[PDB]
């Protein structure tokens, strides 16, 4: 679990969005596992605007933050998991490291702020849904 709180937006994994999320929807993409809903409260997170490929991600299944190198956002085959069919997620970044399902929503961060959220994993890789191209998270 986990979310990004920027301005009056809440960014979550689309597969973990609540009814309150869907009832207050701004934007959703199955192609990215991202959903953004509206909040009453102002959030304190800053979105990175950059092309960093090093950062740190939170791994709930180890109660640890890990430093990683990651690929630039791309179109990636997510091999079938026990609970999710094979599908192609887009705007996806991969790193070598530990992940399990309940780590989806963990933040990846660089020197510039929040880069993305854990979205995929398997065979010793962890996949992050990028948010750095969503410039509108910064305004309105
Ligand atoms: C961190 N992590 N995440 C997942 C995961 O399945 N997330 C669901 C999410 C939504 C979804 C829906 C349809 C098709 C594919 C997908 C893929 N991404 C996972 C599985 C094994 C190990 C680690 C993992
Ligand atoms: Zn950066």
Swiss-Prot record:
Superkingdom of the organism of origin: Viruses
Active-site positions on this chain: 15 (for protease 2a activity), 33 (for protease 2a activity), 104 (for protease 2a activity)
Record field: catalytic activity: Selective cleavage of Tyr-|-Gly bond in the picornavirus polyprotein
Entry binding sites for Zn(2+) 1: 50, 52, 110, 112
The protein's assembly and partners: Homodimer.
Function field: Cysteine protease that cleaves viral polyprotein and specific host proteins. It is responsible for the autocatalytic cleavage between the P1 and P2 regions, which is the first cleavage occurring in the polyprotein. Also cleaves the host translation initiation factor EIF4G1, in order to shut down the capped cellular mRNA translation. Inhibits the host nucleus-cytoplasm protein and RNA trafficking by cleaving host members of the nuclear pores. Counteracts stress granule formation probably by antagonizing its assembly or promoting its dissassembly.
Annotated protein name in UniProt: Protease 2A
Full protein: residues contained: 869 to 1008 of 2193
């Amino acid at each position: 679990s986990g979310a990004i709180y920027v301005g009056n937006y809440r960014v979550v994994n689309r597969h973990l969005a609540t009814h309150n999320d869907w009832a207050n929807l701004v934007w959703e993409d199955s192609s990215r596992d991202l959903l953004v809903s509206s909040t009453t409260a102002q959030g304190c997170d800053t979105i990175a605007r950059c092309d960093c490929q090093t950062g740190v991600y939170y791994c709930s299944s180890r109660r640890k933050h890990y430093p990683v190198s990651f690929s630039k956002p791309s179109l990636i085959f997510v091999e079938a998991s026990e609970y999710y069919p094979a599908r192609y997620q887009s705007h996806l970044m991969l790193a070598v490291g530990h992940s399990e399902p309940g780590d989806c929503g963990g933040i990846l961060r660089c020197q510039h702020g929040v880069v993305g959220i854990v979205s995929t994993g398997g065979n010793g890789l962890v996949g992050f849904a990028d948010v750095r191209d969503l410039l509108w998270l910064d305004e309105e």
